[model samples]
Target: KDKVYKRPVSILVVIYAQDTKRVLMLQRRDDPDFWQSVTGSVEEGETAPQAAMREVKEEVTIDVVAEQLTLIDCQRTVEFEIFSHLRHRYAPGVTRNTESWFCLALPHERQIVFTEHLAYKWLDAPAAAALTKSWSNRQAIEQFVIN
Candidate 1:
């Protein structure tokens, strides 16, 4: 089988506790200083919410549907230049990425079963935005907080 590069479309989900409004942040395994929320690429046949749901489960072990949680579509999207190191994940000549934003509000923060991060913490919205490495991530958290 031929290799398949990642699709340039992705989803950014800002997970938070509804009562406390604390956002969940994951420390990037390879980049210690970079923290973010649940993120993953949209596959060939998946919608943004589908990808968002799958990523949440994969990254933090949260099955939103099974748990009867709501996956809120923020009805927001952003396009940005892809990072040089990650451009290879997309097809050749693909230099840009478009991401859809989502938010998941849990009754409480659950213990995460980490797969791709070094550590995790539940922080307030401002702190989560401040700690994120990507502008889109920070913007997503801000959007969630505002709403």
Candidate 2:
């Protein structure tokens, strides 16, 4: 049997409205109908902050200034097995990911074009949380809703 692996560092970015009422979510290109926030792995030698910003730009063609983003809180050591097709990015036999969480506020009704997603939506907190397939992601959005 073949073994899969996962990366140690990754970013989970909660892109939300400036008013803190709505969130921007994307239906993944690979997963087609599954929706999620802007997320990606940290590149070699790049800080998690840099990776998060770069992922936003690469995945959604949005220019977000560093100050516009905030490290809300880190969700320490949430582990999950890597998706089968994406497991090769990590070291051998390492099948779980360690992710850091971040959030960014969009100024207003900014137009977002999909580069790595099939579709995008601006959803209210409950709607956003309900749409996401991952419990951790849903939990993060729930936290944002109360905070």
Candidate 3:
């Protein structure tokens, strides 16, 4: 079976440790210099929060339950051009993606089992925002601080 093209809609999740004043950042396995928060495309018929929670689990192996963790909708959307190098993941003529922002608040930072990334860092919001590769990722971290 052929690989299905990704949907244009996606979710960006900023995992925040409120007690430690830190956010989780993952170093990209493919591009080591690129660091970001949990992010993934919305599967067909999936809602934004579901996509966000799923991404957090898939990428970092963190089980995010609404009862135990606070999933804050940042009430923001960002549209950006898909990077040219990975444009094949999307359908033809789909050059941009719409990403909904979310924040997962934890009382303290937890141990992470990395699947997709080389390493993870617990950094303050400013550090996370500055070190992340994508603009939306930085924005998501910044949004986490205020929301």
Give stretches of model 1 more than 4 Å off: 1-3
Candidate 2, 4-85: lDDT as tens digits: 3335678888888877579888998667757998888887789888887898888987767644545454544366666766
Q: Per-residue lDDT for 60 in model 1?
A: 90
Candidate 2's TM-score: 0.80
Locate the minimum summed-lDDT window of 10 residues in model 1: 83-92
lDDT score, residue 135, model 1? Answer: 93
Per-residue lDDT tens digits for candidate 1, residues 11-123, read: 99989999899999999875688899988899988889999999999999899999999899999999999877657667889998999999999998778898889999999
Measured against the true structure, the TM-scores of the candidates, in listed sequence, are: 0.92, 0.80, 0.90
TM-score of 3: 0.90
Q: Score candidate 3 by lDDT.
A: 0.85
Which regions of candidate 3 are displaced past 4 Å? none
Instruction: State model 2's lDDT.
Output: 0.76
Q: Write the residue-wise lDDT of candidate 3 on 1-147 in tens digits.
A: 798898989998888888987988899875788888888899988899989888888898777784467788989999999888778889989999999998888888888899989999899889889998799888777766743
Of 2 and 3, the candidate ahead on lDDT is 3
Q: Rate the local accuracy (lDDT) of all candidates.
A: 0.88, 0.76, 0.85
Best by lDDT: 1
- Residue 125 in candidate 1, Cα distance off native in Å: 0.9
Candidate rank order under lDDT: 1, 3, 2
Q: Taking the candidates one at a time, how many backbone clashes does each contain?
A: 0, 2, 0
